[PDB]
Amino acid sequence: KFPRAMPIWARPDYNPPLLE
């Protein structure tokens, strides 16, 4: 199941990921 509780694609304060 995929809940819409602040997912990764819909994040205002998304943390900085690794260097891709």
| Residues of the chain by 3-state class (helix, strand, coil), percent to 5 | 0, 0, 100
State both tokens at 18: 């690794």
User: Quick one: 10 exposed, middle or buried, by C-beta within 10 A (0-12, 13-18, 19+)?
Assistant: exposed
Distances (CA, A) of 1 to 13, 16, 17: 23, 26, 24
Q: Please, are residues 10 and 4 in contact by the beta-carbon 8 Å criterion?
A: yes
Question: How many other C-beta atoms are found inside a 10 Å radius of the C-beta of residue 20?
Answer: 3
Give CA separation, 12 vs 1, 2, 6, in Å: 22, 18, 9
Distance CA 17, CA 14 (A): 9
**Diameter of the chain measured on Cα atoms:** 29
Experimental method: NMR
All residues at 6 or more sequence positions from 4 whose CB lies less than 8 Å from its CB, including other chains: 10
